[PDB]
Design an enzyme around this catalytic site. Structure first.
Site, mmCIF file in Angstrom:
data_model
loop_
_atom_site.group_PDB
_atom_site.id
_atom_site.type_symbol
_atom_site.label_atom_id
_atom_site.label_comp_id
_atom_site.label_asym_id
_atom_site.label_seq_id
_atom_site.Cartn_x
_atom_site.Cartn_y
_atom_site.Cartn_z
ATOM 1 N N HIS A 147 115.809 50.810 25.774
ATOM 2 C CA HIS A 147 116.258 50.033 24.621
ATOM 3 C C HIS A 147 117.348 49.090 25.123
ATOM 4 C CE1 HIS A 147 114.858 53.419 21.710
ATOM 5 N NE2 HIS A 147 113.944 52.468 21.785
ATOM 6 N N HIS A 163 119.931 56.999 26.712
ATOM 7 C CA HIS A 163 120.131 56.078 25.606
ATOM 8 C C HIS A 163 121.601 56.066 25.181
ATOM 9 C CE1 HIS A 163 115.805 55.613 24.211
ATOM 10 N NE2 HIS A 163 115.711 56.526 25.160
ATOM 11 N N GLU A 199 121.393 48.846 24.641
ATOM 12 C CA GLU A 199 122.197 50.011 24.999
ATOM 13 C C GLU A 199 122.807 49.823 26.397
ATOM 14 O OE1 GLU A 199 119.491 53.339 24.393
ATOM 15 O OE2 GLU A 199 119.105 52.737 22.339
ATOM 16 N N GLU A 254 122.277 60.668 24.572
ATOM 17 C CA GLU A 254 122.825 59.569 23.789
ATOM 18 C C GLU A 254 124.282 59.477 24.205
ATOM 19 O OE1 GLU A 254 121.286 57.527 21.907
ATOM 20 O OE2 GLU A 254 119.389 58.535 21.451
ATOM 21 N N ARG A 309 116.410 45.483 20.666
ATOM 22 C CA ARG A 309 116.039 46.850 21.047
ATOM 23 C C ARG A 309 114.687 46.920 21.770
ATOM 24 N NH1 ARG A 309 116.342 52.221 19.104
ATOM 25 N NH2 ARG A 309 114.380 53.279 18.585
HETATM 26 ZN ZN LIG Z 1 117.649 54.165 22.412
#
Ligand SMILES: [Zn+2]
Ligand SMILES: [Zn+2]
Ligand SMILES: [Zn+2]
Ligand SMILES: [Zn+2]
Ligand SMILES: [Zn+2]
EC number: 3.4.17.1
Lengths: 74, 301
Positions: free
Chosen positions: B67, B192, B70, B266, B125
């Protein structure tokens, strides 16, 4: 580019209100002061229907209007 | 050299690619550059292989930047690449990992999106594939694990659009082909941001994975290690119970291929800056994340 190197970012003109626009170069859209953005899209969110399971940014959900909420996809 | 590289700032695609070449030139016995495919817009897609040799060594996959917005992930990927060359031969645990295992690191999994976040749309994204007047597919909804099922959007303009068919995005198909043709991956780590979470499968179904008890324990340990450096607090759990139902996802697919140690990180923060994490947090984020990743690798070995 100058925009990014100064700590900002490129955004489409339609996603950067005049008051948040910067003169810095390198974007084929416009340099934007992302710290001055409000609303769902401005905070990295997407307006979705209420029944969609998501991580809601509740403070920005009102900007999505009736039957919608602000989701941030991670 | 990579000693003089600025790890505390965000870089362009081209700068990261030049960094790969420099790192390989400096450590030709340890790292090699593989092209796993070519992006929608014609850019090479690169993975770094870290290996001390051997045959069919059990492998760890790490993808970052699937993505594009990020940015902390690609930045962490660059730091990881250098860290692997620095600590091999020094840290006994990491040396032991690379003496028994190979690591495959994809710093920029979505290069077209990455370029686009730098020059046009910082909050982009998706990939940049076209057909529609709307552009791109959510590359973390394109995998063949609950593809097209609840947890993605069927609308091409959506941020979670799954695409036309599983693996339609060359950025995903390239990984799938590479990992399946390799045949001996034991861990698969998707990186991510943001939210400070360590997630195991599934996203696409509420069914608990057979290995839930073990992966949950591994997650707990990795989260504790991460916290020890700067006090950064992570939560952990399955994707579906912790964030939301998500289909066509990378670790759901990898786990279903038999790759047991499949986790999605994350990274920082919890919403203050979100995707726009200041460059001053790059190094501290990468350092603490490495402690979490090393903990998972140690359990794999
Ligand atoms: Zn992501
Ligand atoms: Zn630039
Ligand atoms: Zn380039
Ligand atoms: Zn070195
Ligand atoms: Zn363990």
């Amino acid at each position: 580019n100058e925009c990014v190197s100064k700590g900002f970012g490129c955004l489409p003109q339609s996603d950067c209100p005049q008051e948040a626009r910067l003169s810095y170069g390198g974007c084929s859209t416009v340099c934007c002061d992302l710290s001055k953005l409000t609303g769902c899209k401005g905070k990295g969110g997407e307006c979705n229907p209420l029944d969609r399971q998501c991580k809601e940014l509740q403070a920005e959900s009102a900007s999505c209007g009736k039957g919608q909420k602000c989701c941030v996809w991670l | 050299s990579t000693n003089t590289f600025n790890y505390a700032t965000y870089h362009t695609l081209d700068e990261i690619y030049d960094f790969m070449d420099l790192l390989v030139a400096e450590h030709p016995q340890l790292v090699s550059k593989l092209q796993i495919g070519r992006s929608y817009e014609g850019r090479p897609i690169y993975v770094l292989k870290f290996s001390t040799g051997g045959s069919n060594r059990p492998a760890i996959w790490i993808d970052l930047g699937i993505h594009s917005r990020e940015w902390i992930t690609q930045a962490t990927g660059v730091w990881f690449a250098k860290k692997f060359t620095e600590d091999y031969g020094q840290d006994p645990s990491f040396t032991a990992i690379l003496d028994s295992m190979d690591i495959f690191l994809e710093i920029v999994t979505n290069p077209d999106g990455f370029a686009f976040t730098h020059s046009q749309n910082r909050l982009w994204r998706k990939t940049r594939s076209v057909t529609s007047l709307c552009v791109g597919v959510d590359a973390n909804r394109n995998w063949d694990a609950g593809f097209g099922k609840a947890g993605a959007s069927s609308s091409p303009c959506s941020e979670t659009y799954h695409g036309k068919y599983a693996n339609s995005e060359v950025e995903v198909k390239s990984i799938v082909d590479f990992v399946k043709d390799h045949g001996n991956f034991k861990a698969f780590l998707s990186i991510h941001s943001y939210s400070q979470l360590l997630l195991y499968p599934y996203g696409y179904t509420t069914q608990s994975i057979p290995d839930k008890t073990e992966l949950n324990q591994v997650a707990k340990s990795a989260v504790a290690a991460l916290k020890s450096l700067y006090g950064t607090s992570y939560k952990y759990g399955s994707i579906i119970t912790t964030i939301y139902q998500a289909s066509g996802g990378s670790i759901d697919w990898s786990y279903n291929q038999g790759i047991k140690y499949s986790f999605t990180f994350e990274l920082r923060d919890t919403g203050r800056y979100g995707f726009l994490l200041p460059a001053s947090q790059i190094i501290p984020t990468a350092q603490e994340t490495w402690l979490g990743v090393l903990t998972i690798m140690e359990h794999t070995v």
